[PDB]
Design a protein around this ligand. Sequence first.
Ligand SMILES: [Mg+2]
Ligand SMILES: [Zn+2]
Ligand SMILES: [Zn+2]
Ligand SMILES: [Zn+2]
Lengths: 257, 192, 35, 98, 64, 48, 240, 44, 477, 40, 49, 115
Amino acid sequence: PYANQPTVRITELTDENVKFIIENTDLAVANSIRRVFIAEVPIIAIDWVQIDANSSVLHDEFIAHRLGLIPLTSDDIVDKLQYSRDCTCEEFCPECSVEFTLDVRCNEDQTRHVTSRDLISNSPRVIPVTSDDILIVKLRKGQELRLRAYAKKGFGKEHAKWNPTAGVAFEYDPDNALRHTVYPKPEEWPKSEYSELDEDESQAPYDPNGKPERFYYNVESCGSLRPETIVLSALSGLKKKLSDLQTQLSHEIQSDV
Amino acid sequence: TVINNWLLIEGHTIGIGDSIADSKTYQDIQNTIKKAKQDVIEVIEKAHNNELEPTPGNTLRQTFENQVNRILNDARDKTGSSAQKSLSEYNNFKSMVVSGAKGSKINISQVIAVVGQQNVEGKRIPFGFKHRTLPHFIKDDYGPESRGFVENSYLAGLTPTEFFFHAMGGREGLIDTAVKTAETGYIQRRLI
Amino acid sequence: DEITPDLWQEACWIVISSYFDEKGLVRQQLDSFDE
Amino acid sequence: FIGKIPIMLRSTYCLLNGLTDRDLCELNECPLDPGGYFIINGSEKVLIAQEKMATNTVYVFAKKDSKYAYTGECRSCLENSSRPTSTIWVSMLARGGQ
Amino acid sequence: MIIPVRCFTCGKIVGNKWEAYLGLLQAEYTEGDALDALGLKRYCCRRMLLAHVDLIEKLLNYAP
Amino acid sequence: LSEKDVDPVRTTSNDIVEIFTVLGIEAVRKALERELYHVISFDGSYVN
Amino acid sequence: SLKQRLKGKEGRVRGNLMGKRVDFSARTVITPDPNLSIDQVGVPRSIAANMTFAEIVTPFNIDRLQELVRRGNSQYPGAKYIIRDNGDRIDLRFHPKPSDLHLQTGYKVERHMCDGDIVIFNRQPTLHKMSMMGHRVRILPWSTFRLNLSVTTPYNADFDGDEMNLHLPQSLETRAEIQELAMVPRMIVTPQSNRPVMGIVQDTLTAVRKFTKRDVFLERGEVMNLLMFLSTWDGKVPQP
Amino acid sequence: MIYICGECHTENEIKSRDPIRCRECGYRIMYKKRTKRLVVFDAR
Amino acid sequence: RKLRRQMDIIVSEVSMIRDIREREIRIYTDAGRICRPLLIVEKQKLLLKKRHIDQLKEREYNNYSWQDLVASGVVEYIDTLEEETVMLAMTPDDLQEKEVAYCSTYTHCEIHPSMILGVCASIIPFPDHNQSPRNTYQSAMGKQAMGVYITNFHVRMDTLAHVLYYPQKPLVTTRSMEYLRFRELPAGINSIVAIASYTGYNQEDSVIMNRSAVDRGFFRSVFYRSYKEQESKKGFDQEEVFEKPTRETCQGMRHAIYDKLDDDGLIAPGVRVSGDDVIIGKTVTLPTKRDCSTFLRTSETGIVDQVMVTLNQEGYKFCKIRVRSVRIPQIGDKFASRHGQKGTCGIQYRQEDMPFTCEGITPDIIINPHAIPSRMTIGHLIECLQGKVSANKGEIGDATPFNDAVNVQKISNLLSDYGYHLRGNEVLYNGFTGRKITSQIFIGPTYYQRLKHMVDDKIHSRARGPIQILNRQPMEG
Amino acid sequence: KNVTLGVPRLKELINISKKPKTPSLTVFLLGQSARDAERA
Amino acid sequence: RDGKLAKPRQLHNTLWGMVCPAETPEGHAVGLVKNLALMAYISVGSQPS
Amino acid sequence: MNAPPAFESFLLFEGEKKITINKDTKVPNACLFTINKEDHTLGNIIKSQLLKDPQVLFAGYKVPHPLEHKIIIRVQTTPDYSPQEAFTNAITDLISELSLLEERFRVAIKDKQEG
Ligand SMILES: [Mg+2]
Ligand SMILES: [Zn+2]
Ligand SMILES: [Zn+2]
Ligand SMILES: [Zn+2]
């Protein structure tokens, strides 16, 4: 009737991904954790662009679209940053957004690569991840791109540019003991990397009493957050969602009685 | 709603694995076509040597075409049945056909066993060239290949002549579809 | 000497490439107008 | 001077004839553009090939509805002259008449 | 026209790999080897560079 | 119909005009039913 | 001449009396929606905010219609016009002033189309009665019409780009007519062949065949999820 | 009121009444300059 | 024949036909005769030898081209009349090789059987694995796809134009696509397509799209509308010029804001516009001066892209204004594969809601399994399987129709070597619950196209609109 | 044997015409010829 | 008049290699609007002298 | 033109209740919890926690429409136990579980980072 006692075993921890296993958890909790990784972990991304000059071959909202998709380092600044909607400022301020500026002019005969290295932020904590660099536009001689942008807080449920993961591999029951997937010909299917079966074996013997547990994660990060910071932010954010829900539930119960 | 949300668990698909057949099934399909071609060749040799006796109510040409079209139709049926019996309970082509959601037994046979005879105006492919359906055949070639019998399945792919004869037969459906659209509601508004 | 079957596929598309290098795809419109 | 002939693009008499791809780009022309059309009042106009029966050839057809059992027509046209075409029919009257 | 910043499927960064990919190809790398060297393991991210057509390069041949 | 050894009852024609001028309007009503039914029921379809 | 005006397929008699353009008609692309009832059509908010239904002001709806007038055209659902007892039309968006917007019995408020409004949903060609059926409106947040997958068969409609027409009955008399004669549920069985005109279709038909197999066993959690979508469920979980 | 020549790319101020043409180029295809008004884009 | 093959007195396009039975030789030299090149065969042997191929291989820096093949007498054009007297071999390696002597008098050989297809049919991969009408449907759809219609599209000012943000060349391609320059100007994107019944929103030719993929520019396109207006001085009584109308100057002006217009009566590039806005301010002097400015359609809402002012052929000042509108894919937009699999977007799910593989790969598009069985477009399934091998192998796949070196078994065997089920199936997990889907889903890269038909261009409503004066009946206003 | 069917046959009925496309009879035999092929 | 006598919508055998068998519009113009095959060429004519 | 703002999925508009409880008259001790601006993330996690309670007779959730952003959670408990009480306990048990997971993930990171 009470909470699970989940355990964590980190299998790999690099700068690009964190691989870990969670045991003694429900499948619903395991899945809701990976959905929070994608959709509910806040990061900082450009969501406001003004283009003073754009002589490039890409139109203004083509450039603005690419700017939003450039990941910005938002490891610790994101937590203390506020949501523009929540902030009381005049639609933008240092407490809820980061100002960015791009001013690139091509005067040389060679093609000028406007990369994220040319994005300059007023907050050193929030910079493009790459600073190879992310290509924004290539400029011909005489063409220029002059714009200023504001990066604000958000999560992947509003736009995929606020999604901090470059890939979230999620798995459970690699040997198919629970028969949650039925193979017409089990011999035809390659073994999972987490499989613990012999070469001759194709499926683990059916486990009627078994339950989904020991979920395998591999959270690849775009660069805005460290792969471990995504998971910690997700667990706290999901816990915040439930704690916020309970507060509203308590009020509704009090009103009913 | 209830079965749309159970299908989130069961899931349903269709892929290449649903179009393959057992190596035993393919050999049986291939054997049926090889025998069917020989049977048609035997019928042709009868007509060529004047050993074919016309059936009542039909001329020699119509007797020959009827005999050939039945041999090829039987081969399509025999091969089509052989393919269907090879399908497992897990096959998704069968699952949609069995439930009546989409597809039919003939589609499975064409995808898996044999597309069959292509017909233009209810007859085999006509001799559009001088006694030839295409320049790649000899003159007076009444064999299944020459007159538009597609011996390959859609999985195996059609040969260049089969592809063209299939387009000829498939162009008839497009014309008929346009004709029906033109006549759509014509009788209704006259009756009304 | 002779184009063997193992080299035929490469050969047939070298011939086709040369045709389109010389003619292009609207050679009918241009040749008719030039005449 | 007797008039102006509309020019098909990338024909031998077009300004973009024999130009290298760099030369085309300098003129704001796509090197991949095939030409083969006309620019009439700024509209790229393409002449669709029109399919018509061959001329100077004798063709024998049979018509059930008509009063002729057979008819051999021949649309005659000169050698690159006299654009007008004259058709002559040599028909056999149907045997239906009793 | 230009390399997408992110892979559409997963959102992995791909906008900093086009020039590196072209450089590797010039180094006699096969397209498969070059994609492996850049860390594009999922076939969705390999699709991004394998199928990219760089039209922006030809767009820059027209004088502004 | 008048020919000897030919069923004068079941023998019929698909031409409604021929039926009208030989058997009458009521035979046309029945024959028109049967011709109309044949075309509708040809492919197994059903109409009330 | 006068003769030319009357003659022709576009003539007055055949082009302006037998068939003609009609007000309060919408058209857009149709997309599937398995979450709607067979008798329910999903409607874009832009279409709903444009098409209006004139409601006669009554003490039953005096307060409700007063609010819609206050909200006006800017806010949806609102209203476009007010028709006084004189029959004169007042354009709301020109003036949101409450002083001139007081309502009284007999006034008609051309409120915006809302959920539950009866519409006639049609696909051309209209070959049989089931090609024009009555639907209940359901405002949804994108720019397409939505159809339950079962009503595709009577309409002969596919979701490969097909478009369908929406007509909004404008009076209670004609609105009550659709409800009792032309609603989709009343059209389930056709008199042409005394058999149902719509049935279960592609995904559901394939899945119900799988679902009903002898060796389909649902665990407690799975069953409780399915019963959430059984609107007619009486709340009693059957003995397994 | 700045117009850019389509050939030489020269900004030149032209009135409504006076004819449209490059001051120095003589080219008769002119392009209006980008508006100084600021338009905001969501990087979405 | 010898003279024609030598480019002697007889030119290449002259067709000689002999009717042996009818004792007639017909020679044709006029225009309009449709012909195609065929390889010449003598004594059951192609006159095309390896030496011809080697010279062709070094086509450049060698001066050897297609004409030398015609000059050499190795390939000649055959018109339809002459083709009746020709004994034709589909391939050299199977037809004129020593075997059961079906025919030992071949006179010509097809260069390749796939040349019977046209431009639009030449982009269908594995068209010989598809039911024929669906190859006809794709030829129609392929002309309505989006991409880059021409490279210098910025200079051009067309009435309509659709440009895709990120056109991709197909992972699975045909040999003929090289000569169509499709690789140069592609129309579509390679998409991870799962053929599954996920939530019932892809039923009946409908498509489920990935919202997160759309957020990243997936199938995003640009719409360019160009408006041309000219000022005419014809008639001394009446004259019209470009200028922003003023309330006092003109007796009658609509309440629509004219602030967007400049002092010259033209809007400037980079200005948001809508139906309420006026792009061209044109006023005609009365016999005060009446205003005849040009407005936008209410449906349109974009940004002025380019404004050019010139003189038309008639010598009158006129302006072409290009308005740019970005089109993000949404519910109701048509998408099609290269196999007649046309469908609208039923719904869009975010990445967390989509079904994911063990690797975390979510489909960009989910199509219904019920679209395939009736259409029998197996080439769609072979493309998806081949595309998966291509993406993993790093090689662009070959889908040339009549290729005996490519078959499903060979593609399946390759897919096994990359740690994938040989038939292209994958174990997908439910996005909403994370539970394994009982059936394994067929998922892989397939080339999809965005068709010009967007829902926004089609949605339209009428409610007490601008009736006509004469007929007192509805009309567009 | 083939007879008109589908729409063209349906059109003839509503479009009653003195000349059908494929006029025909269905003669039934009542004597011994009915059961005897030779006498038939 | 020519089209009435013989139906030109149908795909004829002689279109092989000359006209694409697949590319034809759907609707009232099926089979009437055709496209050239890739290597098909239309002769420009010359003098028979 | 009808596109809804992307924040409509997770932001309550003015006058919108995050959660509303409606007694289910079909069965005793049954309540329906309509949670606005929520999706399967909280619906699935809450429902699975409820199923662990042996006093919960029935637990299920649903999104009535994907284009809308409400989840309805139906909880049926035993007579001595309230659905509201069951619902609160599930959230606390989930918070306790997630709190424990946060603590143990931090320890695992240090172990991996340290060596
Ligand atoms: Mg349709
Ligand atoms: Zn602030
Ligand atoms: Zn990826
Ligand atoms: Zn100049």
